[PDB]
Design an enzyme around this catalytic site. Structure first.
Site, PDB file in Angstrom:
ATOM      1  N   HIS A 136       0.800  -1.222   0.000  1.00  0.00           N
ATOM      2  CA  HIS A 136       0.000   0.000   0.000  1.00  0.00           C
ATOM      3  C   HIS A 136       0.843   1.288   0.000  1.00  0.00           C
ATOM      4  O   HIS A 136       0.264   2.362  -0.193  1.00  0.00           O
ATOM      5  CB  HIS A 136      -1.089   0.040   1.083  1.00  0.00           C
ATOM      6  CG  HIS A 136      -0.592   0.164   2.491  1.00  0.00           C
ATOM      7  ND1 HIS A 136      -0.077   1.353   2.976  1.00  0.00           N
ATOM      8  CD2 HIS A 136      -0.671  -0.721   3.512  1.00  0.00           C
ATOM      9  CE1 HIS A 136       0.202   1.133   4.255  1.00  0.00           C
ATOM     10  NE2 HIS A 136      -0.131  -0.101   4.622  1.00  0.00           N
ATOM     11  N   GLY A 145       2.559   6.229  10.224  1.00  0.00           N
ATOM     12  CA  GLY A 145       3.975   6.135   9.875  1.00  0.00           C
ATOM     13  C   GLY A 145       4.639   4.843  10.352  1.00  0.00           C
ATOM     14  O   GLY A 145       5.773   4.536   9.956  1.00  0.00           O
ATOM     15  N   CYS A 159       3.575   1.773   9.696  1.00  0.00           N
ATOM     16  CA  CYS A 159       3.425   0.701   8.679  1.00  0.00           C
ATOM     17  C   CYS A 159       4.771   0.174   8.232  1.00  0.00           C
ATOM     18  O   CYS A 159       5.691   0.962   8.053  1.00  0.00           O
ATOM     19  CB  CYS A 159       2.625   1.185   7.476  1.00  0.00           C
ATOM     20  SG  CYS A 159       0.892   1.527   7.822  1.00  0.00           S
TER      21      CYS A 159
HETATM   22  O1  LIG Z   1      -4.199   2.130   8.972  1.00  0.00           O
HETATM   23  C1  LIG Z   1      -3.313   2.747   8.398  1.00  0.00           C
HETATM   24  N1  LIG Z   1      -2.206   3.206   9.026  1.00  0.00           N
HETATM   25  C2  LIG Z   1      -1.901   3.069  10.395  1.00  0.00           C
HETATM   26  C3  LIG Z   1      -1.253   1.964  10.946  1.00  0.00           C
HETATM   27  N2  LIG Z   1      -1.076   1.751  12.256  1.00  0.00           N
HETATM   28  C4  LIG Z   1      -1.551   2.660  13.097  1.00  0.00           C
HETATM   29  C5  LIG Z   1      -2.228   3.840  12.696  1.00  0.00           C
HETATM   30  C6  LIG Z   1      -2.740   4.788  13.616  1.00  0.00           C
HETATM   31  C7  LIG Z   1      -3.362   5.892  13.130  1.00  0.00           C
HETATM   32  F1  LIG Z   1      -3.842   6.805  14.015  1.00  0.00           F
HETATM   33  C8  LIG Z   1      -3.526   6.146  11.789  1.00  0.00           C
HETATM   34  C9  LIG Z   1      -3.055   5.246  10.882  1.00  0.00           C
HETATM   35  C10 LIG Z   1      -2.395   4.062  11.299  1.00  0.00           C
HETATM   36  C11 LIG Z   1      -3.558   3.355   7.013  1.00  0.00           C
HETATM   37  C12 LIG Z   1      -2.657   4.501   6.452  1.00  0.00           C
HETATM   38  C13 LIG Z   1      -3.900   5.025   5.715  1.00  0.00           C
HETATM   39  C14 LIG Z   1      -4.786   4.273   6.724  1.00  0.00           C
HETATM   40  O2  LIG Z   1      -3.955   4.345   4.437  1.00  0.00           O
HETATM   41  C15 LIG Z   1      -3.784   2.988   4.567  1.00  0.00           C
HETATM   42  C16 LIG Z   1      -3.812   2.238   3.410  1.00  0.00           C
HETATM   43  C17 LIG Z   1      -3.765   0.860   3.500  1.00  0.00           C
HETATM   44  C18 LIG Z   1      -3.704   0.266   4.739  1.00  0.00           C
HETATM   45 CL1  LIG Z   1      -3.834  -1.470   4.853  1.00  0.00          CL
HETATM   46  C19 LIG Z   1      -3.616   1.012   5.901  1.00  0.00           C
HETATM   47  C20 LIG Z   1      -3.648   2.402   5.815  1.00  0.00           C
END
Ligand SMILES: O=C(Nc1cncc2cc(F)ccc12)[C@]12C[C@H](C1)Oc1ccc(Cl)cc12
Ligand SMILES: O=C(Nc1cncc2cc(F)ccc12)[C@]12C[C@H](C1)Oc1ccc(Cl)cc12
Ligand SMILES: [Cl-]
Lengths: 305, 298
Positions: free
Chosen positions: A41, A143, A145
């Site tokens: 992603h 961030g 990920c």
């Molecule tokens: O969930 C995601 N990232 C976060 C991972 N962990 C804690 C997080 C805590 C947060 F407060 C925000 C995003 C987080 C996101 C980033 C945005 C949403 O686009 C995405 C596209 C694909 C996928 Cl599978 C996931 C995501």
């Protein structure tokens, strides 16, 4: 003496963390030999996330669209491929800090250490467990990920998890290092919710054996149970079924303490019924399920107090 | 989202862990530049008399698969300093710092100079640590990391009869009224770190747990009478000032959160949990909460 939620030393993994940037998105990658592994992603826009066609987005990319940074050094991308939900970026430099490693897919109930990272920089390490509903109760901000989960038995690092997303309830979902998700999740922003979670019964029993090892028996009783009667009661408290495999796995802790698995099962039944009555077990007022039978044997002394 | 007991990444410390053997005793040492620091009880007491009878070759120092040669030795308080012929090429940027009760740090537990685990803990008001250590763990160290600098604050020396742990700073000064010998020693009655419980209540509010909030406020005087009754450490104006940022972020004044804590102390949780805990957690400082809810990297 003592019992702490212990993580593996993170040094071998820290030397593999890199930053991957694609367009406006920056996340973490794992650099092993001449390949950088990261969530696919990274190639998505926010709009793309509702219904992304990863094959179509990837075909439009070239090697120089991916910026990989290892410390203060820019790595050059010389190839790219997708394997399930993981992007594999071939780089021109092999990681000189690559430890001895394996990619392992774990089962629910298994524990692992997480090295939480931001911008390819490690910020902290914590211990966690793959829940029965395939999510992890992590601590991740935007961030994070691409941060990874691992175990280090001997000098070999077994990578078992890569972080991909946070679900609406605040729990986390991800894949193994071959890009296969744990659970019925997709790297898509759709209505996805974690299933009702349950307590990891075999882990609670292991933790009760750890308490006995460290010198505490207040919770034991004079009863036993059949395995089926234990399961009929424990399922009423949202506990996972205990299988003959779990009973076999608890064999060594049973032999060390002299307490039969089904007698420890009877003590668990009574604890669920009565609560703790102002008491604690290993400094906790709740029944702990994020220590496996293997973790207890590793951390605790071989001589029962 | 999420709130975990998080330790600092341990890599910079792992590259400093060595095994020190003297006679029949094997424990851990910290190799920084050309000096190995370890508990002086490795020679076991009249420590000067025991030390004068030792030569450099009596100390066997092993770094991975390599034997380091000891070329000098000296004692500083309860720490032994072994001068070696090789400087540690992995020596990070570091400082030796003495911490105060209530402050937290990461511990890299080692056995035979080999790191086995990392956990986060706090120096209790009674100067002990509730660690997880077995025989062979002596010489394991506690640290914090600020940017790229490792601040070493603890070196493990002993386990007390209640299962709690005691040690020194890296200059060999003990934390607490403890001595390094096999004798009758007991930890004093411990208390709860009030400022840390308040910080953890702010972390819960930041994460969406607000059931314990109420419309009431209190004074420092009134709250401190409640804290004294429940074995909680006194809350000072310094603690109130330190909680300022978390109070501004959540909109809950520190004495407003104290009125919430007072009700939790007098009524309990009533079958509820806060951040997945049925007890009030005191091993996260105001700084740890701000750092884990901001993502500071090293
Ligand atoms: O969930 C995601 N990232 C976060 C991972 N962990 C804690 C997080 C805590 C947060 F407060 C925000 C995003 C987080 C996101 C980033 C945005 C949403 O686009 C995405 C596209 C694909 C996928 Cl599978 C996931 C995501
Ligand atoms: O306390 C000690 N060692 C332990 C340190 N941590 C966890 C331990 C866990 C154990 F199960 C046993 C000893 C431990 C001992 C070793 C024996 C007692 O002689 C000593 C002389 C001086 C000092 Cl400061 C300490 C000790
Ligand atoms: Cl597994």
């Amino acid at each position: 003496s003592g019992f702490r939620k212990m993580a593996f030393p993170s040094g071998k993994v820290e030397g593999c963390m890199v930053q991957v940037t694609c367009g406006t998105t920056t996340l973490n990658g794992l650099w092993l030999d001449d390949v950088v592994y990261c969530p696919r992603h990274v190639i998505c826009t926010s709009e793309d996330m509702l219904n992304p066609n990863y094959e179509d987005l990837l075909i439009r990319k070239s090697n120089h669209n991916f910026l990989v940074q290892a410390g203060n050094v820019q790595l050059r991308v010389i190839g790219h491929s997708m394997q399930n939900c993981v992007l594999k970026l071939k780089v021109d430099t092999a990681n000189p800090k690559t430890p001895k490693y394996k990619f392992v897919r774990i089962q629910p109930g298994q524990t692992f250490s997480v090295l939480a990272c931001y911008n390819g920089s490690p910020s902290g390490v914590y211990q966690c467990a793959m829940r029965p509903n395939f999510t992890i109760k992590g601590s991740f901000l935007n961030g994070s990920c691409g941060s990874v989960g691992f175990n280090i038995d001997y000098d070999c690092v077994s990578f078992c998890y890569m972080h991909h997303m946070e679900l609406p309830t605040g729990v986390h979902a991800g894949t193994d290092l071959e890009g296969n998700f744990y659970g019925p999740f997709v790297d898509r922003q759709t209505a996805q919710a974690a299933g009702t979670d349950t307590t990891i019964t075999v882990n609670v029993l292991a933790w009760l054996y750890a308490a006995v090892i460290n010198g505490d028996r207040w919770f034991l009783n004079r009863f036993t149970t059949t395995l089926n009667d234990f399961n009929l009661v424990a399922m009423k408290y949202n506990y996972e079924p205990l299988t003959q495999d779990h009973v076999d796995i608890l064999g060594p802790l049973s032999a060390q303490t002299g307490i039969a698995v089904l007698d420890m099962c009877a003590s668990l039944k009574e604890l669920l019924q009565n609560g703790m009555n102002g008491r604690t077990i290993l400094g906790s007022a709740l029944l702990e399920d994020e220590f496996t039978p293997f973790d207890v044997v590793r951390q605790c002394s071989g001589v029962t107090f």
